[PDB]
Design a protein around this ligand. Sequence first.
Ligand SMILES: O=C(c1cn[nH]c(=O)c1)N1CC[C@@](CF)(C(=O)O)C1
Length: 167
Amino acid sequence: VNSFSGYLKLTDNVYIKNADIVEEAKKVKPTVVVNAANVYLKHGGGVAGALNKATNNAMQVESDDYIATNGPLKVGGSCVLSGHNLAKHCLHVVGPNVNKGEDIQLLKSAYENFNQHEVLLAPLLSAGIFGADPIHSLRVCVDTVRTNVYLAVFDKNLYDKLVSSFL
Ligand SMILES: O=C(c1cn[nH]c(=O)c1)N1CC[C@@](CF)(C(=O)O)C1
């Protein structure tokens, strides 16, 4: 038993809700919140900008130190950093950004990072400003992640489309 509430169960291990991931994280304090990161951990917009804003820019400060030490992430890769006031940990995961021409097949590699964590609150990778089809992203998620994932979808309209079209 865990503290996630109001989720629709899609599969044995994948759950989905129309929610703002920032507010969801603030209430649940999950062990892991996933950020839709880029390789530079520049949290300007989308989910990343919103999560970082909710940390009063502490996520960005920590991220800049991480990059200065380690260099950029790989597309499809991840790193674990602090969850600040939102979660114990933040798993920064880099999905491919279609608006940069990145290979969509890397989306499966990105979701594989979730399997290193037993339970996660997450957005749909490569959705939103990353330019992928959220329905494809949901399919890859279900077919790749084996751990328990609670997906927050900010847009009510997209949420309804994702549920109604789910196979
Ligand atoms: O991750 C986010 C997000 C969350 N909060 N603020 C943001 O700008 C972006 N996504 C993924 C797809 C999205 C709609 F395009 C949705 O979830 O409905 C937005």
